[PDB]
Design a protein around this ligand. Structure first.
Ligand SMILES: Cc1c(C(=O)NCc2cccc(C(=O)Nc3nc4c(s3)CN(C)CC4)c2)nnn1-c1nonc1N
Ligand SMILES: Cc1c(C(=O)NCc2cccc(C(=O)Nc3nc4c(s3)CN(C)CC4)c2)nnn1-c1nonc1N
Lengths: 395, 358
């Protein structure tokens, strides 16, 4: 009685627990969604359970957080399985960025387990380098992620609106180095470092916003993966050549991506850019001969040295012996800021905001694409809501 | 509605013991899901397989932490019914003594009789009446439903009637306790439909308590909803007066020593009940009560007129038979499945049964 009661109550209250109150309600909610079909209702056990719980689950669906609690202001982002909307909570009047992930697309593409690491990082990181997740909820169609709004926009937008000098490039590269080191300290390899995922707050400081490819390292700081992840232009040779029996790699793959980002910032183009995606694949693998700097040079000797130190083979790449050797590079030597107080110094671009719903730093996007896709009526139990049980988070 | 008053209303639903979606009921849902899905044929489905790999281990931890049959030491089997048995148990940790009823899930699924325990669970757990046997805990596994109830060491009234030549003074006491016990059930909005001495138990002081509520039904809109005690209206909507018929049968049996409509063939009993006008054959007022049954008007009857006790203080007076108990485990007053090829959900009609008082 006493030898067990303590451990059981911890499991129900703990926000990091798989069996907390919100996760247990997901189980019952998913069960009602997956069983409520006329063909399945022919079973006495399924029919009687639904007649007993369907009405009380409808009360729960109305009481719990739902999409109707939010007022959509504008679509500010788009991805493979959904979009990001600037929302305002109708009751609290608070402004957030809400990410929607299509359950249909996830089940169809057999990609329904990527969001767990993101949910854990964004909710429990408590880092000034990570975009905060306030709430996570769901319905039969979507997963919803109520995150902090980053009004400064992304670094792709900054690079397109500004001719980035080396002093600015030094600031953003150092912020990325510190942001990635925080992720490595949490026990993760990012595997998708790109300026699209790098967002700026109201003060103009950097935060990582996407963690969909994040994977936990072992005690040796390694990961075993048979499938290449990331983006065609920023992918390192070792994660690009991933396959069964040859996909063993460490955190240094994220440092390759920093070199690609630094090159892109100073040159205006990606180092391995090719009109054909396979052309880019060839260039990354042949980095020894494909990496070239343009004849008209405005970029310093130490800036080129950093790009080349990151854009090599993993065994000779900067970062292999820790983050300190990256910090000690001559490119980062300046009299404007210090590594330990960098996020306290004034950013190169500070956003000029007129309201709490100002989206001037975000490009315009389409809202209605007609109608999407839904799951067909099951003839037997399929359990399409089961991989999403335990996603709900509030705290 | 709205934030955060709907959050208060949601947190109430999770804590309330009478709620269908409290913490223990929600754990039953996940527990049932793991039991009903963990089969190799069902595991061929990617959604079923991945959910099980994600929750099976944590559900095993929960099964070990939550109340289970192993927490109780079985002393003796003291009762038996259609779908199970009643065991005298002792909780290994608290050392407390209870009566544990076991109900077979296999039999409940097979006979399409898996809803009778809900009214009993609600009555026994939330009655808070000295006339109703208390339910302290309700738990379950893949095979049984378990009901940890208060032990009634005095035994049942069938055992009392077989061990004693019951005088009218004793009959007056037990009939009045049944009248008060049934009125408490009617006040809760229920109709018993199985009033028999087998379901009438006595505590350590010798006072009556109703122990079985397997045939109880909630009184429709305002109030309009097993042999030989069965009434002609039930034997083929009716009211609570069908329970008063059974009191008359019980009073007759106590004073005569046989049931009024007794027959060697069960079919013969059925006919006798319907033909009660001609089939019904030592005080005048005792006979008048039996015939009146064959509320305040019951209490006002001349049979209950005595100088020993009063209706409002009856359970405080000394009982006719007080149990002589030697220990806390004294039982002297007591005599002595297929693997699914597809989802069937055999654990679903038992989701929400778990209850822990305090
Ligand atoms: C605009 C914006 C953003 C954004 O634009 N995020 C990108 C974004 C938006 C909407 C949906 C998705 C998406 O489908 N992702 C997937 N990943 C993976 C998928 S499918 C399958 N498999 C390949 C593995 C990884 C991505 N994120 N935050 N944010 C914000 N703007 O202001 N404040 C913010 N937090
Ligand atoms: C011995 C004892 C007792 C007892 O003897 N109870 C009788 C008893 C014991 C074990 C199982 C069952 C049972 O299966 N019932 C069903 N009902 C129904 C069923 S299946 C299907 N449908 C037709 C509706 C009604 C009944 N009840 N309490 N108790 C106690 N003794 O001490 N303290 C106690 N609480």
């Amino acid at each position: 009685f006493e030898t067990r009661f303590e451990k059981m109550d911890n499991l129900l209250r703990d926000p990091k627990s798989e069996v907390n109150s919100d996760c247990l309600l997901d189980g019952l909610d998913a069960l009602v969604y997956d069983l409520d079909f006329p063909a399945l209702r022919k079973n006495k056990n399924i029919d009687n359970f639904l007649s007993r719980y369907k009405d009380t689950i409808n009360k729960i669906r109305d009481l719990r957080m739902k999409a109707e609690d939010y007022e959509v202001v504008k679509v500010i982002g788009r991805g493979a399985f959904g979009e990001v909307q600037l929302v305002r909570h109708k009751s609290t009047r608070k402004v957030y960025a809400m990410k929607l992930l299509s359950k249909f697309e996830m089940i169809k593409r057999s990609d329904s387990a990527f969001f767990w690491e993101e949910r854990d990082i964004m909710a429990f990181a408590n880092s000034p380098w990570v975009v905060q997740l306030f709430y996570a909820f769901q319905d039969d169609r979507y997963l919803y992620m109520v995150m902090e709004y980053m009004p400064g926009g992304d670094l792709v937008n900054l690079m397109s609106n500004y001719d980035v000098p080396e002093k600015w490039a030094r600031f953003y590269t150092a912020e990325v180095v510190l942001a990635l080191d925080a992720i490595h300290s949490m026990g993760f390899i990012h595997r998708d470092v790109k300026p699209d995922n790098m967002l700026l707050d109201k003060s103009g400081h950097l935060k990582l916003a996407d963690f969909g490819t994040c994977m936990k390292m072992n005690k040796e700081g390694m990961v075993r993966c048979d499938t290449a992840v990331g983006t065609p232009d920023y992918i390192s040779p070792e994660v690009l050549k991933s396959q069964g029996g040859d996909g063993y790699y460490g955190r240094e793959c994220d440092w390759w991506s920093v070199g690609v980002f630094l090159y892109e910032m100073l040159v205006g183009d990606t180092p391995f850019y090719a009109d054909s995606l396979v052309g880019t694949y060839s260039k990354i693998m042949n980095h020894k001969n494909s990496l070239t700097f343009p004849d008209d040079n405005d970029i310093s000797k130490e800036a080129k040295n950093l790009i080349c130190a990151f854009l090599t083979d993993r065994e000779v790449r900067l970062g292999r012996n820790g983050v300190e050797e990256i910090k000690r590079h001559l490119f980062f030597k300046n009299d404007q800021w210090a590594w330990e107080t960098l996020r306290d110094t004034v950013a190169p671009v500070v956003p000029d905001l007129s309201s709490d719903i100002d989206t001037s730093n975000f490009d315009d996007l389409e809202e209605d694409k007609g109608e999407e896709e839904t799951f067909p009526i099951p003839k037997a139990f399929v359990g399409n809501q089961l991989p999403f049980v335990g996603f709900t988070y509030y705290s």
